[PDB]
């Protein structure tokens, strides 16, 4: 029995779509789009190279409105002129039958490009800040919140029209929705405020319901709704939200929307060292274990966090159904083929400047390629 066999087993999503292996190509912002965020030849070449890499692929962040933009040259999905380029992207990504999911993003106060463009960004609660430049964080009015919900509806429809297989709503650390769920950042006293878990969840639940409704009315059969999240938020020995609160949130998300998977994010933390700080029975247990237990097989869990090898992929399956990798697919796009062919020793994550064309990496500078790779999962290996 081949040691890595479990990673090659097929899986069905809740909606009946069959994925032929357990690998997911994780979100990666290549930072090679136009200033408006339109899909470029470089974007397409990068994706083409990786269209036969994994059972399922999730794009880097595609921003839903100008004030939500993080990366300077990331994907845009905020207006209809984006559709032609995104249509090329979806087609490119789907050409070998790998599923192509576009991540819809709004970075709230962490929308670095919006800070530079406008000197102002939006969040649950007001702030005046000095880094990266002097800017203000404006508390979102109810009108602004409604417009954001509409922008998620609009972006979902654009993804559908572009021929993607699905969308992923990310609410991970440093996303607008996360900043409403956290009691560190959300100091509001209205119905989107810190007073109750329902109030903190409200923005997330309104978005998921709105997106589900668009899919119901507009999407091809079995269009996939994905969900990505950071299961707890800590700062020293305080929590901005507990893993039990997160577990309640995902139960509520399932009540309002037909999510097909949960992808766990742990920016700046390796999977082997990502343990819970929620007091009680959870304390010190692996975050993926706690979440996997709570999911109770309702939807597949996609593990991530520096997974980079046959052995780390296999180990992740102890508390997950699928494994996502970010930077390994940058330098080793054929990882899963080598594994399927029972050649795990052939996997090589090193690259020289000689490989840049075969790998279809847009950036010439080694320091930019490194920065690109490291930013996805926030690790340095």
Short mmCIF file of C-alpha atoms in Angstrom, two decimals:
data_model
loop_
_atom_site.label_atom_id
_atom_site.label_comp_id
_atom_site.label_asym_id
_atom_site.label_seq_id
_atom_site.Cartn_x
_atom_site.Cartn_y
_atom_site.Cartn_z
CA UNK A 1 0.00 0.00 0.00
CA UNK A 2 1.46 3.28 -1.28
CA UNK A 3 1.92 5.64 1.69
CA UNK A 4 0.47 8.70 -0.07
CA UNK A 5 -2.60 6.92 -1.50
CA UNK A 6 -5.14 8.76 0.74
CA UNK A 7 -4.20 12.08 -0.91
CA UNK A 8 -5.12 10.68 -4.32
CA UNK A 9 -8.57 9.44 -3.32
CA UNK A 10 -11.54 11.21 -4.88
CA UNK A 11 -14.02 13.22 -2.85
CA UNK A 12 -17.53 14.50 -3.46
CA UNK A 13 -18.62 17.93 -2.40
CA UNK A 14 -22.04 18.16 -0.65
CA UNK A 15 -23.60 19.10 -4.03
CA UNK A 16 -22.38 15.89 -5.70
CA UNK A 17 -19.46 17.33 -7.69
CA UNK A 18 -16.60 14.85 -7.73
CA UNK A 19 -13.03 16.03 -7.20
CA UNK A 20 -10.44 13.53 -8.31
CA UNK A 21 -7.90 14.11 -5.54
CA UNK A 22 -7.51 15.83 -2.16
CA UNK A 23 -5.31 18.74 -3.31
CA UNK A 24 -6.40 22.36 -3.53
CA UNK A 25 -4.31 25.07 -5.16
CA UNK A 26 -4.58 27.80 -2.49
CA UNK A 27 -5.15 31.54 -3.06
CA UNK A 28 -2.08 33.28 -4.40
CA UNK A 29 -1.91 36.86 -5.55
CA UNK A 30 0.56 36.92 -8.40
CA UNK A 31 0.31 40.74 -8.56
CA UNK A 32 0.54 40.79 -12.38
CA UNK A 33 -2.82 42.29 -13.36
CA UNK A 34 -3.36 45.80 -14.80
CA UNK A 35 -3.66 48.78 -12.41
CA UNK A 36 -7.47 48.47 -12.85
CA UNK A 37 -7.15 44.79 -11.95
CA UNK A 38 -7.84 43.44 -15.42
CA UNK A 39 -6.50 40.00 -16.34
CA UNK A 40 -3.22 40.16 -18.29
CA UNK A 41 -1.29 37.79 -20.56
CA UNK A 42 1.07 37.19 -17.60
CA UNK A 43 -1.88 36.29 -15.34
CA UNK A 44 -3.13 33.81 -17.93
CA UNK A 45 0.29 32.22 -18.49
CA UNK A 46 0.74 31.68 -14.74
CA UNK A 47 -2.70 30.07 -14.38
CA UNK A 48 -2.33 27.96 -17.55
CA UNK A 49 0.85 26.38 -16.14
CA UNK A 50 -1.10 25.35 -13.00
CA UNK A 51 -4.40 24.27 -14.62
CA UNK A 52 -3.50 20.58 -14.27
CA UNK A 53 -1.94 20.88 -10.76
CA UNK A 54 -4.78 20.11 -8.31
CA UNK A 55 -8.35 18.77 -8.03
CA UNK A 56 -9.58 22.28 -7.20
CA UNK A 57 -8.09 25.80 -7.51
CA UNK A 58 -8.92 28.98 -5.64
CA UNK A 59 -7.72 32.30 -7.13
CA UNK A 60 -5.98 35.05 -5.25
CA UNK A 61 -8.23 37.83 -3.90
CA UNK A 62 -10.54 39.52 -6.41
CA UNK A 63 -11.73 42.82 -4.94
CA UNK A 64 -15.42 43.72 -4.93
CA UNK A 65 -15.14 47.55 -4.69
CA UNK A 66 -12.37 50.20 -4.81
CA UNK A 67 -12.20 50.78 -1.04
CA UNK A 68 -11.66 47.03 -0.46
CA UNK A 69 -8.50 46.67 -2.59
CA UNK A 70 -5.34 45.32 -0.90
CA UNK A 71 -2.80 44.37 -3.57
CA UNK A 72 -1.75 46.95 -6.15
CA UNK A 73 -2.00 44.56 -9.12
CA UNK A 74 -4.41 41.91 -7.85
CA UNK A 75 -7.60 40.80 -9.60
CA UNK A 76 -10.59 43.15 -9.79
CA UNK A 77 -14.22 42.00 -9.95
CA UNK A 78 -15.91 45.32 -9.11
CA UNK A 79 -17.34 46.30 -12.49
CA UNK A 80 -18.58 44.68 -15.69
CA UNK A 81 -15.49 45.67 -17.74
CA UNK A 82 -13.68 43.01 -15.69
CA UNK A 83 -15.80 40.23 -17.18
CA UNK A 84 -13.93 39.69 -20.51
CA UNK A 85 -10.56 39.12 -18.79
CA UNK A 86 -12.05 37.03 -15.99
CA UNK A 87 -13.76 34.90 -18.65
CA UNK A 88 -10.35 34.13 -20.19
CA UNK A 89 -9.07 33.32 -16.67
CA UNK A 90 -11.85 30.88 -15.82
CA UNK A 91 -11.42 29.11 -19.16
CA UNK A 92 -7.64 28.86 -18.70
CA UNK A 93 -8.02 27.44 -15.22
CA UNK A 94 -10.66 24.85 -16.24
CA UNK A 95 -8.98 23.40 -19.35
CA UNK A 96 -7.88 20.15 -17.70
CA UNK A 97 -11.07 19.74 -15.66
CA UNK A 98 -9.69 21.16 -12.43
CA UNK A 99 -12.37 23.13 -10.61
CA UNK A 100 -11.85 26.91 -10.73
CA UNK A 101 -13.10 28.97 -7.77
CA UNK A 102 -12.66 32.77 -7.64
CA UNK A 103 -12.09 34.31 -4.19
CA UNK A 104 -14.19 37.46 -3.55
CA UNK A 105 -12.45 39.86 -1.20
CA UNK A 106 -12.90 43.09 0.71
CA UNK A 107 -9.95 43.93 2.99
CA UNK A 108 -11.76 46.55 5.11
CA UNK A 109 -9.21 48.77 6.89
CA UNK A 110 -6.36 46.58 5.62
CA UNK A 111 -7.07 47.61 2.02
CA UNK A 112 -3.56 48.92 1.46
CA UNK A 113 -4.09 50.15 -2.10
CA UNK A 114 -7.28 51.99 -1.08
CA UNK A 115 -5.31 53.69 1.72
CA UNK A 116 -2.79 54.92 -0.86
CA UNK A 117 -5.46 55.87 -3.44
CA UNK A 118 -7.92 57.68 -1.19
CA UNK A 119 -6.34 58.34 2.23
CA UNK A 120 -9.36 56.61 3.74
CA UNK A 121 -10.76 53.12 4.23
CA UNK A 122 -13.78 51.59 5.95
CA UNK A 123 -14.24 49.36 8.93
CA UNK A 124 -16.67 48.73 11.75
CA UNK A 125 -15.19 51.41 14.02
CA UNK A 126 -13.38 54.72 13.46
CA UNK A 127 -9.60 55.12 13.75
CA UNK A 128 -6.90 57.63 12.88
CA UNK A 129 -3.67 55.95 11.81
CA UNK A 130 -0.15 56.87 10.59
CA UNK A 131 1.10 53.72 8.79
CA UNK A 132 1.59 53.22 5.85
CA UNK A 133 0.52 56.87 5.42
CA UNK A 134 -1.73 59.24 7.37
CA UNK A 135 -5.26 57.88 6.89
CA UNK A 136 -8.64 57.58 8.55
CA UNK A 137 -10.72 54.46 9.03
CA UNK A 138 -14.37 55.47 8.55
CA UNK A 139 -17.08 53.56 10.45
CA UNK A 140 -19.47 51.99 7.94
CA UNK A 141 -22.98 53.37 7.92
CA UNK A 142 -25.89 51.03 7.39
CA UNK A 143 -26.14 52.46 3.82
CA UNK A 144 -22.46 51.60 3.24
CA UNK A 145 -22.99 48.10 4.66
CA UNK A 146 -25.95 47.59 2.31
CA UNK A 147 -23.84 48.76 -0.62
CA UNK A 148 -21.09 46.25 0.34
CA UNK A 149 -23.67 43.47 0.45
CA UNK A 150 -24.83 44.57 -3.04
CA UNK A 151 -21.21 44.58 -4.20
CA UNK A 152 -20.84 40.97 -3.05
CA UNK A 153 -24.02 40.18 -5.02
CA UNK A 154 -22.63 42.00 -8.08
CA UNK A 155 -19.23 40.30 -7.86
CA UNK A 156 -20.84 36.87 -7.51
CA UNK A 157 -22.83 37.50 -10.71
CA UNK A 158 -19.65 38.57 -12.56
CA UNK A 159 -17.88 35.38 -11.46
CA UNK A 160 -20.89 33.37 -12.70
CA UNK A 161 -20.88 35.17 -16.07
CA UNK A 162 -17.12 34.57 -16.42
CA UNK A 163 -17.73 30.81 -16.24
CA UNK A 164 -16.01 29.99 -12.97
CA UNK A 165 -17.09 26.82 -11.18
CA UNK A 166 -17.71 28.74 -7.97
CA UNK A 167 -16.89 31.67 -5.71
CA UNK A 168 -15.20 31.65 -2.33
CA UNK A 169 -16.15 34.23 0.27
CA UNK A 170 -13.15 34.79 2.52
CA UNK A 171 -13.73 36.11 6.04
CA UNK A 172 -10.17 35.32 7.19
CA UNK A 173 -7.94 37.56 9.30
CA UNK A 174 -7.68 41.05 7.73
CA UNK A 175 -10.91 40.80 5.75
CA UNK A 176 -13.70 43.32 6.37
CA UNK A 177 -16.14 40.66 7.54
CA UNK A 178 -13.63 39.32 10.10
CA UNK A 179 -13.18 42.81 11.53
CA UNK A 180 -16.94 42.90 12.35
CA UNK A 181 -16.81 39.48 14.00
CA UNK A 182 -13.85 40.41 16.23
CA UNK A 183 -14.36 42.23 19.53
CA UNK A 184 -10.84 43.69 19.15
CA UNK A 185 -11.89 45.76 16.09
CA UNK A 186 -15.69 45.98 16.39
CA UNK A 187 -16.60 48.60 19.02
CA UNK A 188 -20.05 49.40 17.51
CA UNK A 189 -23.20 49.84 19.56
CA UNK A 190 -25.71 49.21 16.76
CA UNK A 191 -27.17 45.95 15.40
CA UNK A 192 -23.78 45.18 13.77
CA UNK A 193 -22.05 45.74 17.10
CA UNK A 194 -20.12 43.96 19.83
CA UNK A 195 -23.14 43.43 22.18
CA UNK A 196 -24.00 39.94 20.98
CA UNK A 197 -22.63 37.16 18.89
CA UNK A 198 -25.58 37.53 16.49
CA UNK A 199 -24.76 41.22 16.03
CA UNK A 200 -21.08 40.45 15.35
CA UNK A 201 -22.08 37.70 12.89
CA UNK A 202 -24.70 39.85 11.18
CA UNK A 203 -22.53 41.22 8.35
CA UNK A 204 -21.15 37.75 7.57
CA UNK A 205 -24.62 36.17 7.55
CA UNK A 206 -26.17 38.93 5.40
CA UNK A 207 -23.35 38.52 2.86
CA UNK A 208 -23.60 34.72 2.73
CA UNK A 209 -27.38 34.82 2.35
CA UNK A 210 -27.14 37.48 -0.37
CA UNK A 211 -24.50 35.52 -2.29
CA UNK A 212 -26.53 32.28 -1.98
CA UNK A 213 -29.58 34.09 -3.39
CA UNK A 214 -27.62 35.27 -6.41
CA UNK A 215 -26.31 31.76 -7.03
CA UNK A 216 -29.87 30.32 -6.76
CA UNK A 217 -31.17 32.78 -9.38
CA UNK A 218 -28.21 33.12 -11.74
CA UNK A 219 -25.67 30.29 -11.63
CA UNK A 220 -25.22 27.14 -13.70
CA UNK A 221 -26.06 23.83 -12.02
CA UNK A 222 -23.94 23.05 -8.96
CA UNK A 223 -22.01 26.31 -8.93
CA UNK A 224 -19.85 26.10 -5.78
CA UNK A 225 -20.02 28.44 -2.79
CA UNK A 226 -16.80 28.20 -0.78
CA UNK A 227 -15.92 29.74 2.55
CA UNK A 228 -12.52 30.57 4.07
CA UNK A 229 -11.95 31.65 7.65
CA UNK A 230 -9.51 32.00 10.55
CA UNK A 231 -11.00 29.96 13.42
CA UNK A 232 -9.86 32.20 16.28
CA UNK A 233 -8.26 35.56 16.88
CA UNK A 234 -5.68 36.10 19.64
CA UNK A 235 -3.47 38.88 20.90
CA UNK A 236 -1.29 37.77 23.81
CA UNK A 237 -3.71 36.15 26.27
CA UNK A 238 -6.81 37.93 24.96
CA UNK A 239 -9.14 36.65 22.27
CA UNK A 240 -11.00 38.79 19.72
CA UNK A 241 -13.21 35.77 19.13
CA UNK A 242 -13.09 32.23 20.48
CA UNK A 243 -13.10 29.01 18.50
CA UNK A 244 -16.54 28.25 20.00
CA UNK A 245 -17.83 31.55 18.66
CA UNK A 246 -16.35 30.65 15.27
CA UNK A 247 -18.00 27.23 15.41
CA UNK A 248 -21.34 28.91 16.10
CA UNK A 249 -20.71 31.28 13.19
CA UNK A 250 -20.14 28.43 10.75
CA UNK A 251 -23.33 26.70 11.96
CA UNK A 252 -25.22 29.93 11.20
CA UNK A 253 -23.53 30.28 7.77
CA UNK A 254 -24.74 26.74 6.94
CA UNK A 255 -28.26 27.77 8.00
CA UNK A 256 -28.36 30.61 5.44
CA UNK A 257 -26.17 29.31 2.61
CA UNK A 258 -25.16 26.10 0.90
CA UNK A 259 -21.41 26.30 1.55
CA UNK A 260 -19.50 23.42 -0.03
CA UNK A 261 -16.29 23.54 1.99
CA UNK A 262 -14.47 25.37 4.76
CA UNK A 263 -10.89 26.39 4.06
CA UNK A 264 -8.95 27.18 7.21
CA UNK A 265 -6.53 30.14 7.09
CA UNK A 266 -3.72 30.68 9.65
CA UNK A 267 -1.71 33.65 8.36
CA UNK A 268 1.79 33.59 9.77
CA UNK A 269 1.31 30.23 11.52
CA UNK A 270 2.43 26.75 10.46
CA UNK A 271 -0.16 23.99 10.64
CA UNK A 272 1.98 22.00 13.07
CA UNK A 273 2.03 24.88 15.54
CA UNK A 274 -1.50 26.21 15.18
CA UNK A 275 -3.12 25.41 18.53
CA UNK A 276 -6.15 26.96 20.20
CA UNK A 277 -5.97 29.53 22.99
CA UNK A 278 -9.69 29.25 23.82
CA UNK A 279 -9.94 28.40 27.54
CA UNK A 280 -11.37 25.00 28.51
CA UNK A 281 -11.18 21.60 26.78
CA UNK A 282 -10.06 23.24 23.51
CA UNK A 283 -7.05 24.90 25.02
CA UNK A 284 -3.80 23.79 23.38
CA UNK A 285 -5.51 21.41 20.92
CA UNK A 286 -4.88 21.84 17.18
CA UNK A 287 -7.24 24.37 15.63
CA UNK A 288 -7.93 22.01 12.70
CA UNK A 289 -8.88 19.22 15.10
CA UNK A 290 -11.41 21.40 16.93
CA UNK A 291 -12.97 22.64 13.69
CA UNK A 292 -12.96 19.17 12.04
CA UNK A 293 -14.78 17.78 15.10
CA UNK A 294 -17.38 20.50 14.92
CA UNK A 295 -17.98 20.10 11.18
CA UNK A 296 -18.88 16.44 11.87
CA UNK A 297 -18.61 15.58 8.17
CA UNK A 298 -21.21 18.14 7.03
CA UNK A 299 -18.75 19.74 4.61
CA UNK A 300 -15.12 19.03 3.72
CA UNK A 301 -12.38 20.87 5.60
CA UNK A 302 -9.40 22.13 3.60
CA UNK A 303 -6.25 22.34 5.73
CA UNK A 304 -3.43 24.82 5.01
CA UNK A 305 -0.47 26.51 6.68
CA UNK A 306 2.91 25.76 5.17
CA UNK A 307 1.99 22.31 3.83
CA UNK A 308 4.84 21.64 1.38
CA UNK A 309 5.61 17.94 1.12
CA UNK A 310 4.09 14.48 0.72
CA UNK A 311 4.47 13.96 4.47
CA UNK A 312 3.03 17.30 5.59
CA UNK A 313 0.11 16.80 3.15
CA UNK A 314 -0.53 13.31 4.51
CA UNK A 315 -0.34 14.45 8.13
CA UNK A 316 -2.84 17.25 7.46
CA UNK A 317 -5.39 14.60 6.49
CA UNK A 318 -5.49 13.61 10.17
CA UNK A 319 -7.85 16.54 10.81
CA UNK A 320 -9.05 17.48 7.31
CA UNK A 321 -10.50 16.09 4.07
CA UNK A 322 -8.42 18.12 1.63
CA UNK A 323 -5.09 19.93 1.68
CA UNK A 324 -4.32 23.35 0.27
CA UNK A 325 -0.84 24.47 -0.71
CA UNK A 326 0.21 27.97 -1.74
CA UNK A 327 3.96 28.50 -2.45
CA UNK A 328 4.71 24.83 -3.32
CA UNK A 329 2.59 25.22 -6.44
CA UNK A 330 4.60 28.29 -7.46
CA UNK A 331 7.89 26.39 -7.77
CA UNK A 332 6.53 22.84 -8.13
CA UNK A 333 3.27 23.00 -10.16
CA UNK A 334 3.53 19.26 -10.94
CA UNK A 335 3.70 18.19 -7.25
CA UNK A 336 0.52 16.07 -7.41
CA UNK A 337 1.44 14.28 -10.63
CA UNK A 338 4.78 13.20 -9.09
CA UNK A 339 2.80 11.95 -6.08
CA UNK A 340 0.17 10.14 -8.21
CA UNK A 341 2.91 8.46 -10.25
CA UNK A 342 4.47 7.20 -6.99
CA UNK A 343 7.56 9.40 -7.44
CA UNK A 344 7.45 11.47 -4.22
CA UNK A 345 11.28 11.84 -4.21
CA UNK A 346 11.08 13.88 -7.47
CA UNK A 347 9.22 16.75 -5.83
CA UNK A 348 11.49 19.78 -5.75
CA UNK A 349 10.57 23.19 -4.32
CA UNK A 350 13.82 24.88 -5.38
CA UNK A 351 14.03 27.04 -8.49
CA UNK A 352 16.69 29.03 -10.35
CA UNK A 353 16.15 32.01 -12.69
CA UNK A 354 16.44 29.44 -15.52
CA UNK A 355 13.06 27.99 -14.48
CA UNK A 356 11.13 31.29 -14.66
CA UNK A 357 9.77 30.72 -18.18
CA UNK A 358 8.71 27.06 -17.71
CA UNK A 359 7.07 28.12 -14.43
CA UNK A 360 5.45 31.14 -16.16
CA UNK A 361 6.35 33.42 -13.26
CA UNK A 362 5.75 37.06 -14.36
CA UNK A 363 8.36 38.67 -12.10
CA UNK A 364 12.02 38.86 -13.11
CA UNK A 365 13.36 39.89 -9.68
CA UNK A 366 14.08 37.03 -7.23
CA UNK A 367 13.12 39.26 -4.25
CA UNK A 368 9.67 39.87 -5.80
CA UNK A 369 9.05 36.14 -6.41
CA UNK A 370 10.02 35.45 -2.77
CA UNK A 371 7.75 38.25 -1.49
CA UNK A 372 4.89 36.92 -3.66
CA UNK A 373 5.27 33.37 -2.29
CA UNK A 374 5.68 34.39 1.34
CA UNK A 375 2.64 36.68 1.41
CA UNK A 376 -0.02 33.99 0.85
CA UNK A 377 0.54 32.07 4.07
CA UNK A 378 2.82 34.60 5.81
CA UNK A 379 5.62 32.06 6.33
CA UNK A 380 9.31 32.18 5.24
CA UNK A 381 10.29 28.59 4.28
#
